[PDB]
Paper text:
We first grafted 14 cytokine residues implicated in the hIL-4–hIL-4Rα interface onto Neo-2, while preserving Neo-2 residues implicated in the Neo-2–hγc interface. The resulting grafted hNeo-4 was then subjected to random mutagenesis and four rounds of selection using the yeast surface display platform to increase hIL-4Rα binding. Clones from the converged library were expressed in Escherichia coli, and the molecule with the highest binding affinity for hIL-4Rα was selected (hereafter hNeo-4). Overall, 16 mutations were introduced into Neo-2 to derive hNeo-4; 1 of the 14 originally grafted mutations was modified by selection, and 2 more mutations were introduced during selection. The molecular structure of hNeo-4 was determined via X-ray crystallography to a resolution of 2.97 Å and showed atomic agreement with the computationally predicted model. The topology of hNeo-4 in complex with the hIL-4 type I complex was predicted using AlphaFold2, which showed the same overall topology as the native type I hIL-4 cytokine–receptor complex. Similar to previous reports, Kd values for hIL-4 binding to hIL-4Rα and the hIL-4Rα–hγc complex were 0.48 nM and 64 nM, respectively. hNeo-4 had a 121-fold weaker binding affinity toward hIL-4Rα (Kd = 58 nM) than hIL-4 due to a higher rate of dissociation (koff) and a slightly lower rate of association (kon). Interestingly, hNeo-4 had comparable affinity (Kd = 80 nM) for the hIL-4Rα–hγc complex to hIL-4. We validated that the Neo-2-derived hNeo-4 did not exhibit residual interactions with hIL-2Rβ or the hIL-2Rβ–hγc complex, confirming that the specificity was fully transformed. BLI binding studies confirmed that hNeo-4 did not interact with the type II complex.
Author numbering: 3 to 99
The structure:
Amino acid sequence: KKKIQIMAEEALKDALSILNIVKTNSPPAEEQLERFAKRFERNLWGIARLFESGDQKDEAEKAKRMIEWMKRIKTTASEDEQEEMANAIITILQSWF
């Protein structure tokens, strides 16, 4: 399951883009944030499936929760809550190289 590297790289770029949108804009570019969240969620659903196929359920639910965190970023009105989830998502994706 280890080779999921291009998917994690793309997911990291999307997460860092959202993080940049949240900080830069005071009222964020809501449609551009939705564009990156959709791509990110898609990438991590695949990462979760590859971990499931590789019998690595611990890293699979880890990937699943980061989808819920990205969905929270879409919902939440607090910029700091958006930052929190983005930094958490970023640090976990990095654990996967």
